[PDB]
Symmetry: C3
Subunit: 309 residues, 3 copies
């Protein structure tokens, strides 16, 4: 069938609010393993990677925690190749979406041919020289992008990085807050993206068919879904660090995942940007966490129409 390879990643130095490290914990305690098990799958729990804080991690210009971040992605990069090595799907319940540099790295080391689906309200493609806020959780893509190589400077922590995916091989879904420089990158590189504008025009039914035919048209290669919880409307996932209104509906989040699942080409998965601490009432934490589990499971089989052996 499809074997799962779990990697907990309680990292938060890719952005300001630390709580995001609570993700693996909360995710796990919400009953993620048993639920996957209730389905058809050999869950391999490679545990939570221990990250040793970098004592002297002085900024690169305005970029905070570069080494702290770059190593977490390096550590994670190795691991992710080990699970893809044991012929299993890599499942990364992350902290901040900066780890994406890591996930996609180890995955590519194995399947350099993969295709990416970036579900997120943000592009996360700012470079170390375009970032305004200066947080790394919003620049992962620019490190992975081949056509962007040369645009990216030499930052402490990422000597190891080698651009793996090309502009013609990633698709964005759920975008509604792109920085002026990120938009310039989007249109100039010719990146395929479905902002909330297109989801409204085509509906999620057409959006999914187009993303997948655009990705799996020529060849049937490995798929990597980087999933940022803030891709969905804050009424479904309120406990995120950077939420925007006009997001994807509970149902829309479930359609994407069921459709990706259905192709059976998923090789890598990451569930990012959830921070229970940032939720208002205790139920908003429940609402953001449960919704998160409700999506992971759909990726691994669960369909609203039913299942059976």
């Amino acid at each position: 069938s499809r074997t799962i390879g779990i990697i907990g990643a309680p990292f938060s130095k890719g952005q300001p609010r630390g709580g995001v490290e609570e993700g693996p914990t909360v995710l796990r305690k919400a009953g993620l393993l048993e639920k996957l098990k209730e389905q058809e799958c050999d869950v391999k729990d490679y545990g939570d990677l221990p990250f040793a804080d970098i004592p002297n991690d002085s900024p690169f210009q305005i970029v905070k925690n570069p080494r702290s971040v770059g190593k977490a992605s390096e550590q994670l990069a190795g691991k992710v190749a080990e699970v893809k090595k044991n012929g299993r799907i890599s499942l990364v319940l992350g902290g901040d979406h900066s780890l994406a540099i890591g996930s996609i790295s180890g995955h590519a080391r194995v399947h350099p041919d993969l295709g990416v689906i970036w579900v997120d309200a943000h592009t996360d493609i700012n470079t170390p020289l375009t970032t305004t806020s200066g947080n790394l959780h919003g620049q992962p893509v620019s490190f992975l992008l081949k056509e962007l190589k040369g645009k990216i400077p030499d930052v402490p922590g990422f000597s190891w990085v080698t651009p793996c995916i090309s502009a013609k091989d990633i698709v964005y879904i759920g975008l509604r807050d792109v920085d002026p420089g990120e938009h310039y990158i989007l249109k100039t590189l010719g990146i395929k993206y479905f902002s909330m504008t297109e989801v409204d025009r085509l509906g999620i039914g057409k959006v999914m068919e187009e993303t997948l035919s655009y990705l799996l048209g020529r060849k049937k290669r490995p798929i990597h879904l980087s999933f940022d919880v803030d891709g969905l409307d804050p009424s479904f996932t309120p406990a995120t660090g950077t939420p925007v209104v006009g997001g994807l509906t509970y149902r829309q989040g479930l359609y994407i995942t069921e459709e990706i699942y259905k192709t059976g080409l998923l090789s890598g998965l990451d569930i990012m940007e959830v921070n229970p601490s940032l939720g208002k009432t205790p139920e908003e934490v429940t609402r953001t966490v449960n919704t998160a589990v409700a999506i992971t499971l759909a990726c691994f089989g669960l369909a609203r129409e039913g299942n059976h052996k």
Copy 2:
């Protein structure tokens, strides 16, 4: 025009929470008659059927209140034929969705040629031998289904039942919680169904056109819409006994009904599973009840674009 035949059915022994018997009451007191009247229709209020509790109604295996349930459907079965007999549309504001065995019975006795539209978050097609919870409110379809005859055992209360509708003559809309055995029945019998997955893919616009062309393609026969309030998202109908998230929007519920109305082939209608007692605030009761009325009326003419004589 189209004459209405009202039948109140305060039954609840098809499931655990009794409040569902409040439906006819609350429905009526919400001003259902006058509103229908405000439109074009001869409302015939055949009243609320008096159900005498069955003193000794011991379970059939794990199936509770079999006789209590089977007779309510038998009583109701008769009545429903009387209204279809007086050339009127049968309108059943029910209690629990177990009465469906009854509604569809008396209706079929008259128009054995009818077609069914099961709007519900659940299939309600468990047999007396597949039911896990063991409640009858989640097995009505298996009693009505011809291809299922032979699968259904001999249970106290339903000697009278004769499978009326066939697998190729019912359509499910709003499904998102189907039991492992129910799903096996769905796919094996080749039943037409639009789970929330398809509503997301095709949108309600295409879903309605496809359900109706699939049903009314060959011939223009009678239509029976069994409507379970939990078919809609619990933010619109929170006062239900078994609600699921990811449901149908207020607007989507209204589109189905306006489209069914527009065909003018509606012969039977049932509004089930509403239980005011199960609502949190007093307004959630108002929200679930009013939404319910807002759908009934659409079935009988009211259109968001307007009306006039």
Copy 3:
């Protein structure tokens, strides 16, 4: 590029609740000017028109404040021609949707060839002789409509009015509460309209393409978008005087505006029916006001996918 011409219009005598006059104020204080500026546009703030209350404004039959209303539209009519005169888009943050008679007047005086997009949960096409409630905020269209001339009586305050737009030149979007007489006008005149029923059938993607091809098919003429905040669901714009459930989603409101913007044929705009006083919590005021700004800006360039110079 596209120059903006602002006209504040704190008018409320077109309906009962006065607060609607707070619109220009709240709108402005919410940072509307700077935000437009953040984009590409020469904002011309022609200020808030001073309206002198009419001491003796006795009703015309059941029509309250006729002169008070008719002059506000006359005053506004002049002004709107001045901004269209300075080759700028007319932006009218109004009070009650009765001012529409005015906006569309001065605009037409300049571009008698314009096309109209009436986004609203209501048709607002009752005549002085069909109006039941008797409020003018729900009859603006009947004064502007050519085919309706002759149906409209001679009411104090509007001798100046000359029907500018024809039945084949306006489109309604977001309708869900049309009076029996308004519906009769709709169907008889052959007016193009997309009630919530059609938005559900075609989705907003098809709705926008059809409205614009129906309007801009033959010729590429000026566009006037009259925007009533109650066109959207009261969960997005709760602080309105006459809100209805089943409305347009935040996202749907944004799609319309981005699509209208994209044609680059917008010449006139009005943002009506917002009344902060009528909101429950202080945040519902924030929710209704911010949502309003989020739409204005989309009309003038802001796109969820991004922007840049």
